[PDB]
UniProtKB/Swiss-Prot annotation:
Residues that coordinate or bind substrate: 101
Miscellaneous notes: Lysozyme C is capable of both hydrolysis and transglycosylation; it also shows a slight esterase activity. It acts rapidly on both peptide-substituted and unsubstituted peptidoglycan, and slowly on chitin oligosaccharides.
UniProt key word Disulfide bond: yes
Name of encoding gene: LYZ
Tissue distribution: In the egg white and polymorphonuclear leukocytes.
Protein name (record): Lysozyme C
Length: 129
């Protein structure tokens, strides 16, 4: 499923992301934009044999099990296929685990280079939330 901007802001808000570990709703919407263009079915294969899954492009090496990645740690305790549902819940729950660590949202390369330090509140402007 490809989410509208405001539809996504709503679902993320509903799932408890606003100000989660100090990151405002706009940071999360901006991350999803540049990671996946709001597409829940986005996939991207990597060199090391791993794959990034779903709306926030979460990687199979540490965070989810796809059965195709050597030494997967599955820290979010989910099959990577869960990250490809039209329902964003699994991606949010995994994102919460990822962001709770020292690296914060810096774990997401596209957030770090496109959203970090910008006027991210713009990403929820217009939305009735």
């Amino acid at each position: 499923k490809v989410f509208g901007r405001c539809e996504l802001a709503a679902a993320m808000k509903r799932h408890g992301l606003d100000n989660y570990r100090g990151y405002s709703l706009g940071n999360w919407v901006c991350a999803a934009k540049f990671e996946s263009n709001f597409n829940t079915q986005a996939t991207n294969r990597n060199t090391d044999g791993s794959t990034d899954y779903g709306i926030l492009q979460i990687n199979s090496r540490w965070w989810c099990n796809d059965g195709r990645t050597p030494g997967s740690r599955n820290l979010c305790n989910i099959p990577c296929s869960a990250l490809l549902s039209s329902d964003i819940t699994a991606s949010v729950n995994c994102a919460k685990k990822i962001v709770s660590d020292g690296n914060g949202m810096n774990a997401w390369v596209a957030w770090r280079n496109r959203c970090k330090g910008t006027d991210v509140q713009a990403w929820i402007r217009g939305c009735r939330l």
